[PDB]
Amino acid sequence: GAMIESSTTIQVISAGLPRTGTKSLKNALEIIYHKPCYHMYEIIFNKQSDIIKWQNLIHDSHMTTKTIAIYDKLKELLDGYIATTDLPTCGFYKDLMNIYPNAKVLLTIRDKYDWLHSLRKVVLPKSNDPWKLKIEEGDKVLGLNSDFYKLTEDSLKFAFQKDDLNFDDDQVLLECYDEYNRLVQETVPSDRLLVLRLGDGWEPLCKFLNVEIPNGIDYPCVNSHHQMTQLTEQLIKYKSLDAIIHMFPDL
Ligand SMILES: Nc1ncnc2c1ncn2[C@@H]1O[C@H](COP(=O)(O)O)[C@@H](OP(=O)(O)O)[C@H]1O
Ligand SMILES: CC(C)NC[C@@H]1CCc2cc(CO)c([N+](=O)[O-])cc2N1
């Protein structure tokens, strides 16, 4: 159809948790809107200076006048982006809805056991898993320290609305997953919500957003734990991102 001039502001709020296809969705939204989408990748590879701001925001966000100060920081962080996905943003979906009243909301979901397994390989390995040491070695190469891991934990706790959380307990996480997804579908008006199951592809997304399907471009399939294992190993081998970045065309 016709080309229209789209506003550069948050148009889509994705409430889906990490390891539910948020990076493919990030890529898909950038393909559609030709402007950046927020993601943890954005923080890691472009705005590491944002880490302390999100930490500060989450610190303050257990609390009107205080709220507008929070909302204004949210707005600042997201300036120039057309959508949000993944931690740390997904836990703020209700506030993002107030701040951007004309934004639509997405929920990415998948089989809960697949989600947990993926989360253990990439985001939250058990502390006694030898792989955790490899993840940490690789993360140092990227310039990520304990503050980054703190942001991940605090933003997970914030999304799950838990004051603390036994990260090593699979049953706890599985139940938090189910409750989170459930709560989203109860909070957001069905008029304003689309639930995307992994594998659903362009069609239901583009219909929701009133856009044509990108011509000839397949719906992204990136950020598998196998690919992330390969990246970790390469990072440890070459000791830099820029030495290997050409081998991971997604980034
Ligand atoms: N188009 C697609 N179809 C099926 N699975 C997809 C997909 N895009 C991403 N995924 C899966 O979504 C997960 C990544 O999610 P996220 O980007 O939120 O971290 C990965 O799961 P696995 O680790 O099980 O392979 C990846 O395989
Ligand atoms: C060793 C190296 C490969 N680590 C980099 C990866 C990149 C993907 C990723 C994604 C998330 C959430 O999307 C989190 N997270 O919020 O913890 C951590 C990481 N870490």
Is 199 near ligand 1, meaning CB less than 6 Å away? yes
Residue type, 53: K
Cα 148 from chain centroid (whole Å): 14
Q: From the alpha carbon of 86, which atom of ligand 1 is closest?
A: 18
Domains of the chain: 1-251 (3.40.50.300)
Angstrom distance (rounded) from CA 218 to CA 140: 34
- Cα distances (Å, whole numbers) of residue 242 to 42, 50, 136, 141, 238: 16, 21, 18, 10, 9
By the 10 Å C-beta count (0-12 exposed, 13-18 middle, 19+ buried), 119 is classed as buried
- Phi/psi at 118 (nearest 5 deg)? -65, -45
Mutational test site, ligand 1, from 22, 223, 230, 232, max ligand atoms within 8 Å of CB: 223
Resolution, angstroms, 1 dp: 2.0
Angstrom distance (rounded) from CA 203 to CA 178: 26
Is the N-terminal amide bond of 249 cis, ω within 30° of 0?
no
According to DSSP, residue 91 is labeled: G
Give the closest ligand to the alpha carbon of residue 228: 2
Is 101 near ligand 1, meaning CB less than 6 Å away? no
**CA-closest residue to ligand 1 atom 8:** 221
Is 39 near ligand 1, meaning CB less than 6 Å away? no
**CA-closest residue to ligand 1 atom 11:** 21
- Cα distances (Å, whole numbers) of residue 218 to 29, 180, 184, 198, 226: 13, 30, 28, 14, 20
Beta-bridged to residue 194, according to DSSP, are 106
Q: In the block, which residue shows the tokens 């898909």?
A: 28
CB atoms under 10 Å from CB of 30, counted, come to: 17
Angstrom distance (rounded) from CA 232 to CA 142: 10
Rg (CA), the chain: 18
Task: List Cβ neighbours of 153 (8 Å cut-off, separation of 6 or more).
Answer: 165, 167
The CA 69 to ligand 1 mean position distance, Å, reads: 35
Give the closest ligand to the alpha carbon of residue 54: 2
Give the closest ligand to the alpha carbon of residue 121: 1
Residue type, 175: E
Determination technique for this entry: X-ray
Angstrom distance (rounded) from CA 151 to CA 26: 20
* Residues having CB within 6 Å of any atom of ligand 2: 18, 40, 86-87, 122-123, 135, 138-139, 152, 228, 231-232
Torsion angle (degrees, nearest 10) of CA 225, 40, 20, 59 = 120
- Cα distances (Å, whole numbers) of residue 198 to 50, 112, 124, 160, 235: 29, 12, 20, 21, 28
